Amino acid sequence: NIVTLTRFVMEQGRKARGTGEMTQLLNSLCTAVKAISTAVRKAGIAHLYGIAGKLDVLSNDLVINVLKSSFATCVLVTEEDKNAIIVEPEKRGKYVVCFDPLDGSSNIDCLVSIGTIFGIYRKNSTDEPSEKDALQPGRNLVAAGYALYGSATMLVLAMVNGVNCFMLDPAIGEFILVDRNVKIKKKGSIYSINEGYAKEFDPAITEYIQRKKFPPDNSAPYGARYVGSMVADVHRTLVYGGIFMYPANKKSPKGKLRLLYECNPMAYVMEKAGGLATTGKEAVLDIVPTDIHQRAPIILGSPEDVTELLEIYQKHA
Amino acid sequence: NIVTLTRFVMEQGRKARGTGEMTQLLNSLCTAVKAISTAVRKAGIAHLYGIAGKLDVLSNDLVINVLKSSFATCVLVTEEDKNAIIVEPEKRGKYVVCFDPLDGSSNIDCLVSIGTIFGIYRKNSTDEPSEKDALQPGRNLVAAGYALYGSATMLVLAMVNGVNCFMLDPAIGEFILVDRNVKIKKKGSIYSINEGYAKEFDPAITEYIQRKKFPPDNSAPYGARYVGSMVADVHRTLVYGGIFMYPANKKSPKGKLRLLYECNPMAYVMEKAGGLATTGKEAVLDIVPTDIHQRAPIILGSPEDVTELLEIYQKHA
Amino acid sequence: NIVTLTRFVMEQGRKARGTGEMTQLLNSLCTAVKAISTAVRKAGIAHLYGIAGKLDVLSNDLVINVLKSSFATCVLVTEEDKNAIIVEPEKRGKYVVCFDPLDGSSNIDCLVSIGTIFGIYRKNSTDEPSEKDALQPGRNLVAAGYALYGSATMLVLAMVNGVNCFMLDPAIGEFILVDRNVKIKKKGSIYSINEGYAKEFDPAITEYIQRKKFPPDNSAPYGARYVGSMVADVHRTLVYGGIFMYPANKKSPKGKLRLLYECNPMAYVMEKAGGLATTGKEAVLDIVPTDIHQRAPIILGSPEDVTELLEIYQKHA
Amino acid sequence: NIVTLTRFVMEQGRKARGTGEMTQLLNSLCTAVKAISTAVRKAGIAHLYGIAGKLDVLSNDLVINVLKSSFATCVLVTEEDKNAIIVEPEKRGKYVVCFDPLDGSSNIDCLVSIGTIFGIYRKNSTDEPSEKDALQPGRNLVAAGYALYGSATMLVLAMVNGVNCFMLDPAIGEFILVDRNVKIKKKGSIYSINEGYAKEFDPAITEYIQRKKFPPDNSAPYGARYVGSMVADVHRTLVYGGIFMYPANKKSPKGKLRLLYECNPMAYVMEKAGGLATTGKEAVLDIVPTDIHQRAPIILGSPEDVTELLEIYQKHA
Numbered sequence A, B, C, D: 001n002i003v004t005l006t007r008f009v010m011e012q013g014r015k016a017r018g019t020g021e022m023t024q025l026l027n028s029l030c031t032a033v034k035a036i037s038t039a040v041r042k043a044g045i046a047h048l049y050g051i052a053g054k055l056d057v058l059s060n061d062l063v064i065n066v067l068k069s070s071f072a073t074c075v076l077v078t079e080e081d082k083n084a085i086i087v088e089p090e091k092r093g094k095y096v097v098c099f100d101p102l103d104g105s106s107n108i109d110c111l112v113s114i115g116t117i118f119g120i121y122r123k124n125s126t127d128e129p130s131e132k133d134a135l136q137p138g139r140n141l142v143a144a145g146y147a148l149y150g151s152a153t154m155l156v157l158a159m160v161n162g163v164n165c166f167m168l169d170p171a172i173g174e175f176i177l178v179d180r181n182v183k184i185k186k187k188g189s190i191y192s193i194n195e196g197y198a199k200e201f202d203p204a205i206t207e208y209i210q211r212k213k214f215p216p217d218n219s220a221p222y223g224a225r226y227v228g229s230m231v232a233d234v235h236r237t238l239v240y241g242g243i244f245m246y247p248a249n250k251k252s253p254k255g256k257l258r259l260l261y262e263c264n265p266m267a268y269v270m271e272k273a274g275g276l277a278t279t280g281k282e283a284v285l286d287i288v289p290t291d292i293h294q295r296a297p298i299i300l301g302s303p304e305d306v307t308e309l310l311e312i313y314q315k316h317a
Ligand SMILES: Nc1ncnc2c1ncn2[C@@H]1O[C@H](COP(=O)(O)O)[C@@H](O)[C@H]1O
Pocket: A009, A010, A012, A013, A014, A016, A017, A018, A019, A020, A021, A022, A023, A026, A094, A122, A142, A159
C-alpha cells in the first residue's frame, strides 16, 4: 500500500504523541511547496503573454502566509527579509522556521534546477519571541529538508529518526514516499565545486582537487559536476554520493552560503543520512549563530570523502 | 496577441509555400515533447506505487509513433536504436529525423534537467530510403532544436531564419513564444567542461582552462558550471553566454557526444544564434558522417570564447 | 488567510480531541477523491489512444485501497460489492464506511456530472466486525458527504457541527474551503423528478407536481431540472434550493436509490443544512437497515417544499 | 496511430486545398477552448482565496483575442456583446464567427456542465465587413460545433463531411479524436424539456409530452432529462438519442434560445449527424436572421421523434 506525505506526517505525529501543532506546520509547508512548484513550472504563463481577458517574491509570500496560517509558528527567518518576522500573537505557535523560499534564483532564466530549503527550531527561551530565538545551533533542529524543482519535484524531509524522500505526483497533488530511511554511500566518485575560483582556494582544497583529478594510486579520477544550484548539487550528493564544497576564498572570506537557511538544513539532512558536514575546522551544526544572515564555509557529502579532505586540512595546520 | 508554437509553425509553413508536410511534422514533434515532459515530471506515479492496487524507452516509443503518425518522415535515427528506422511506405513522407529522445538519462535518478534533441533533414535523392539518407553533414539540416525539461519545459527551434524559444504552459498544454530570434553573447563569463578528465586533456584545452582560472591580463576569472546534461549545459550557454566543451580523451579519442543527434542539432542552433561549434579542427556542421552513431568532439558557445581556444589549438598545431 | 481541507480536518480533530484515527480516514478519502477526479477528467486518455510506448471498477479499487491503508476502518460497504468488506485485523480501525464510488455511471458516456457518496459510522457493538455493523440508521452517522465531478470538482462534508464545501484547485491538488456552514433556503423554486414515470406515481406526488406547474394562487410555477445524476441534482438543491424526488413507483416499489450509500449520506447532509429528507411516510435517517443494498424512497430539499408535499401525503391517508 | 485535433484540422485543410486561413482559425479555437476549460475547472482558485496574500467575461475575452490573433476573421458576434465586433483591418481575415463563450453561466454556481458554442460563416460579399455579414441563414455555415465542460471536456466539430468528437486530455493539452463521423439514433427514449412551463405550452407540445408519459400504443414511456444547459442537453441527445425542446411560451412568444450562436450551430451539428432541428414550422437552418440577438424556438434530436411531433404540429395546424 502507498504512503503519502500527509499520512506519514500524521502517523509520525501520532507516534510522537504531539499535540498536532508540528503536524499542521508540516502540512502547511507541503501545501506551500506544491504551490511554488506550480508557479516554477510556469502554469498560467500564457496569461502574462496576452491570451487576453517575481518568482522569489511570490515564493516568499507563499511560504510566509501559509506558515502563519498554520498557527504553529512564532518566528520566521527568510533569506529574502533583512529582519526576522515575528508572528502576531493571535497566530503564534511554538515553532521558528528558517527558510530560503527559492534557492538558485539567478538560475531561473536558464531553467536550471532550483529549490526551497527549510529548518525548524522549537522556541526554547519562552520570552517575547524574537530574532535571538532563531540563533540556535543547527544541532537544535527538530526538522529540516528541501523541495527540489528539477526534472520532477521532490521533498526531502529529515527528522530525528531519519531521512525520507517524497516525489510529487502533480496529477493528484500528493507527495508519495519513494525512498525510505535514506543513507548516503560511504565513498563517492564525484566532487562538486566551482573551480573558477581556483586562484583563491586555500592549500587544503587545492591539494584535494588535484588528488581527485590525478589520484596518487593510479585509480580513476572523480567525475566533476557543478550545477550551481545548492539544492540540486546537494541532492545529487545525497542520492548518488560524493562531496560538495563551497569553501572560503577572497570574495567570500567566510563562504557565500548562509548558515541558518542553507547550511544548517543541508548539514542536518546529511548527518541523518550518515554523511558529514564540516566548515573545514568544525561541524556546521555545532556553530552558534550570532547573526541570522550569517555565512559559513561548507563541505558535505560521503563520510570518507569529507574525512579525507579533513585529514588534509589538519595536515596544513 | 500571443504566439503559440502551433500558430508560428503554420504561418512559417504558409510564408514558405510548403505543402504542409513539414508543418505536420513539427506539430507531431510538439505533441511528443508535451507527452514526454508529462512523464518526466512524474504525473501518475501514484499508480506505480499502488494507489489502486523505462522513461528512456517510453520516450523513444512516443517520438517514434508520433513521428510515424505524421506521414512526413521516411527515415528515423534514434540514439536508442542500433539501426535506423525505415518508415512503412504507407506512412512514408520525405523527412529524415535524427533524435535523442531523452538525453541525460543517467541523471533521471538525481532529478537533474534532461532533454530531447532532434535534427531534421530533407531526403535528398530518389532511391529507397535507408540509413544512408541520414548520413548528411549537419550543414544540410532543414530544422533542428531541443526541448529542456528543467524547472520549466522549453522548446528551442532553429530554422534558416533563426532561433526561437517557446515556453510550455502545462495548464493549457501550449508552447508560447517567449524569446524571438535569439543571438548568443559575443563573449561570456562561464566555461563548462568536466574537469574530472584533466589528466586526459590535450595541451590546448589544458592551457585554455588555465587562462580562465588565472587570466594572464589580470581580468576576472570565469565562473565554472557543468550540470552534466548537454541540453542543460548548452541551453545555459545559449541564453547566458560562454563556452561548453566535450573534447576527446581516453573515453574514446573520438569524443563522447554523438554527431547526428547530439552535436549537429546543437551546432546548428548555435550557428543560427551567432555562435560557433567546432571539434577544435573543423566546424561540426561540415563533418560528413560515416556512421549514424559516430561520436565527435565539440566545443560551442560565444564566438569570441570559441575563437580564443581555436587560437590555442593553432599555437599547438 | 486560506483554509484547506487538510488544515480544517486536522483542526477539527484537535478540537474534538480525537486520537487522529478519523483524521487519517478523512485524509485518505480526500486523496481518493482527487485521484478519481483526475481519472474522470480523462488524464492520460491519449495512452488508450495509442500515443504508443472501467471507470467505476477503478474508482472502486481506489476507494477500497486508500481507505484500507488509512488503518482507520473495519467494514466497507460499496455499491459495487455484493457483500460487506471486512478489513484484515492488521489494518483494522474503528470505522465503517458505506460508499458509492461513482454515482451516475450510465451518464459517463454523455459527460454528465457524476460523483462519489460516502457515509461513515463508528463500529459500536465490539464483536468480530461484520455486515451487521453497517446496518445502522443514518441518524448514527459520524460524518457524510460527497464529491461532485461537474464543471469543477467539489467535496461537501457534513459532520455534527455543520456542512462545508471545498473546491478542488487542480493546479496544486488542494481543496479550498469555499462555503462555510451551509444552510439551504427555506423555500425553493425548482422541483426535480423524472416525470417519465408519471403513469406510475402515487396520488400525492401527482398532486404535488400539478401544484408546481399550475399553482392555485396564480404565482410563478417552479422551474424543472433533472440531470439524472443524484449527486448533481442534490448538489443544486442544497446550493440553490428546491426539492428533489425519487418516490416509489412500479419498476421500483421501494424506490431505486439505495439507503446506506445514497439516501443516508444525502439525508444527513440535508438535515445538517436545515433541510428535510423523508420517505413520504418517515424520516430517512431513522430507518433501521436490514440489508446493506436496501432501497428506499426519497424526497429531500428545502423544509417548506418538503413539508408541503408531506401535508399532501397525510391528506391521502 | 492517434489523431489529435491539430493533426485532423491540418489534413482536412490540405485535402480541401485551403490557403490555411481556416486552419489557423480552427487552431485558435482549440487553444481558446483549452484555456476556458482550465478556468472552468478552477485551476488557481487558491490564489483568489489568499494562498499568497467574471468567468463569463474571461471566456469572452479569451475567445475574442485568440480569434483576432488568428488573422482569419473579420466579424465576431458574441452573446455577451450588444454589437458585433468588427476586426481591425490589420488582422482582418475572411471569416465571420458567431459564438456563445460560456453557455449555462447561471449554472456555474451549482457546478452544472457548461459549454462554448460557435458557428463559422465565410464572408460572402465584398464591401466593408459589418453586422450584416453575420446575418446569414445557418444553411450557409462553413463549420459549427461546441465544447462541453462536463465530467470531461469534449469538442464536437461539424463540417460538410460530418461530425467528429475530440476528448481533451488535460495532461498533455491535446484533443484526441474519439468518435468519428457520428450519426444520431433514428429513435430515442428520452425527451428533454422544462415542464415547469406546462401552463404555457401550445397544444402540440402538450399532446406530445402526454404521448411520451402515457403511450397510446401501450409501449414503454420515455425517460425524462433536463440538465438546464443546452450544450449538455444537446450533447446527451446527439450521443444517446431522443429529443430536446425549447418551444415558445410567455418567456417570449419567440423562444429563449438565440439563433446565431445557440440554435444554428446545434441545428447544423444535428443535421450533419442525421437528425432534425425545427421551430415546429420551419427548419432552423433556413430561417433568414434579421437580428444578431434574434431568438428562435427549436426542437432537435432523432429524426423519428422530431417527425412525430411535427405531425402533431400538423394536426393542430
Ligand atoms: N508530525 C510529527 N512528526 C514527527 N514528530 C512529531 C510530529 N508531531 C510532533 N512531533 C514531535 O513532538 C514534539 C511536540 O509536538 P507538538 O505538540 O506538535 O508541538 C515536536 O516538537 C516533535 O518533537
